[PDB]
């Protein structure tokens, strides 16, 4: 199982990067979604 541990470990640690990166990446997608929605509302204000 030292070999099977080696296999699960490389698998785990690369996957773990997903949490390490998405704590800032997921944040970005939402920031982009927010700006999109915000720009709309100001567009509507200009429609006034």
């Amino acid at each position: 199982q030292m070999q099977n541990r080696k296999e699960e470990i490389q698998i785990l640690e690369m996957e773990a990067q997903a949490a390490a990166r998405l704590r800032q990446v997921m944040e970005l997608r939402e920031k982009e979604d927010r700006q999109r929605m915000v720009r709309m509302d100001m567009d509507i204000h200009r429609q006034q």
Binding site: M2, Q3, K6, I9, Q10, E13
Partner: protein, 50 residues
């Protein structure tokens, strides 16, 4: 005349067995242990993965 006839026959066989018991222990000292170190050699992809 021969109170010391015995012993010599066993000495060759016994010396052999005792040696052999160690022979088995000996291969463990290096073959099994280096095989264990092989596992470290395999583990020591760690630096790459790091």
């Amino acid at each position: 005349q021969l109170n010391d006839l015995e012993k010599l026959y066993e000495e060759k066989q016994d010396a052999l067995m005792r040696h052999e018991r160690e022979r088995r222990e000996i291969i463990t000292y290096e073959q099994e242990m280096r095989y264990s170190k092989l596992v470290d050699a395999e583990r020591q992809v760690r630096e790459e993965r790091l």
